[PDB]
Amino acid sequence: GVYTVGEFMTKKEDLHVVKPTTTVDEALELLVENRITGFPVIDEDWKLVGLVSDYDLLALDTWKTFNAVQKLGKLVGDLMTPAPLVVEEKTNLEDAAKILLETKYRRLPVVDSDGKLVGIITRGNVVRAALQ
Amino acid sequence: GVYTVGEFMTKKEDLHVVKPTTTVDEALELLVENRITGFPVIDEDWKLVGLVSDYDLLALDTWKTFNAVQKLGKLVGDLMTPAPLVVEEKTNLEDAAKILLETKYRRLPVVDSDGKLVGIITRGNVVRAALQ
């Protein structure tokens, strides 16, 4: 495989992450502001520690007033899905594509040799890669 | 219910739709360009005729070269999910929220009295509504 994940992933600076210390409130606000459905969760050393989505934050697994009240408090660390499935930068693009097409996963976190979160490869990234 | 769906939905002009005549190619390209996972499908009279997502277009329900080849041809009309669940503009926001929180649906199409697609209400729209 000559194409790598690092060539088509979403870069670190352009990522919107969240820490386990983050409150559900500001997490939801970040979701709204950045038009997203979830983020990866990192620690202070920028190492991936989990994944968290809207259904985790709103605790769906309930209605409007429940959210009204919810936003008035548990944290991301207690709601996030810990230790997701991960790829690297040097990872062949076709393998990541295999995951993102044979499974129900749309997003795979991309880390480096030290476990530091350095990006995110999405299904849309793969489609774009096929288009470019 | 005093809050309505039309107050917090995604407006018509700001929508990214697709017709059944649309090819899978340009659909995927629109997905990439607009950072989205799917669109509502309308006819020429702007009436909602279906819904289509990335998994429908890539026919996941497979790998990178399969997409390579796929983009070189069936159309949206043969892949879209026809006649989705719908809300109106005058629809109470709390009911739509009930749907978007008690179910696995993140997006509900918003039509008018004539069946014309006039918007889209999302889970993020509900969260934002709770934040505003």
Side-chain angles (χ1 to χ4, degrees), chain A residues 1-65 67-70 72-132, chain B residues 1-65 67-70 72-132:
Chain A
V2 282
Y3 300 104
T4 60
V5 169
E7 293 178 321
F8 297 97
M9 74 182 183
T10 306
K11 324 299 177 181
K12 175 182 176 178
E13 323 129 348
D14 313 21
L15 287 182
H16 301 103
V17 298
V18 132
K19 310 194 180 185
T21 67
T22 310
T23 79
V24 180
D25 234 303
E26 41 190 359
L28 291 178
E29 300 193 62
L30 261 292
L31 286 175
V32 166
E33 289 177 358
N34 297 119
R35 288 292 198 179
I36 42 185
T37 71
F39 350 82
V41 192
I42 61 174
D43 61 5
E44 311 298 335
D45 299 316
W46 264 89
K47 297 184 178 178
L48 186 73
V49 78
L51 283 195
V52 65
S53 298
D54 49 25
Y55 54 85
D56 293 319
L57 295 169
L58 304 172
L60 309 182
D61 302 31
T62 80
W63 59 299
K64 178 79 187 311
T65 300
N67 305 332
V69 170
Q70 182 81 27
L72 289 172
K74 253 170 179 168
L75 308 171
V76 161
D78 304 279
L79 297 177
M80 68 180 186
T81 278
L85 313 174
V86 187
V87 309
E88 264 78 21
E89 287 196 73
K90 294 180 172 185
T91 296
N92 182 15
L93 185 62
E94 284 195 344
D95 296 332
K98 284 169 190 174
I99 303 302
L100 298 164
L101 297 159
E102 299 173 15
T103 68
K104 295 167 177 178
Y105 300 98
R106 282 193 175 114
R107 310 185 241 138
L108 290 181
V110 188
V111 305
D112 59 19
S113 357
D114 290 86
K116 257 202 170 189
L117 178 69
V118 291
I120 289 183
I121 175 85
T122 67
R123 186 171 294 169
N125 296 150
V126 173
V127 178
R128 165 157 60 216
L131 294 173
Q132 292 170 339
Chain B
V2 282
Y3 300 104
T4 60
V5 169
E7 293 178 321
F8 297 97
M9 74 182 183
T10 306
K11 324 299 177 181
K12 175 182 176 178
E13 323 129 348
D14 313 21
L15 287 182
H16 301 103
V17 298
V18 132
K19 310 194 180 185
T21 67
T22 310
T23 79
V24 180
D25 234 303
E26 41 190 359
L28 291 178
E29 300 193 62
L30 261 292
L31 286 175
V32 166
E33 289 177 358
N34 297 119
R35 288 292 198 179
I36 42 185
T37 71
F39 350 82
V41 192
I42 61 174
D43 61 5
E44 311 298 335
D45 299 316
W46 264 89
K47 297 184 178 178
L48 186 73
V49 78
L51 283 195
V52 65
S53 298
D54 49 25
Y55 54 85
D56 293 319
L57 295 169
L58 304 172
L60 309 182
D61 302 31
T62 80
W63 59 299
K64 178 79 187 311
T65 300
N67 305 332
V69 170
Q70 182 81 27
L72 289 172
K74 253 170 179 168
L75 308 171
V76 161
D78 304 279
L79 297 177
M80 68 180 186
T81 278
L85 313 174
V86 187
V87 309
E88 264 78 21
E89 287 196 73
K90 294 180 172 185
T91 296
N92 182 15
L93 185 62
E94 284 195 344
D95 296 332
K98 284 169 190 174
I99 303 302
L100 298 164
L101 297 159
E102 299 173 15
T103 68
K104 295 167 177 178
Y105 300 98
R106 282 193 175 114
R107 310 185 241 138
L108 290 181
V110 188
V111 305
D112 59 19
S113 357
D114 290 86
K116 257 202 170 189
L117 178 69
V118 291
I120 289 183
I121 175 85
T122 67
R123 186 171 294 169
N125 296 150
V126 173
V127 178
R128 165 157 60 216
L131 294 173
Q132 292 170 339

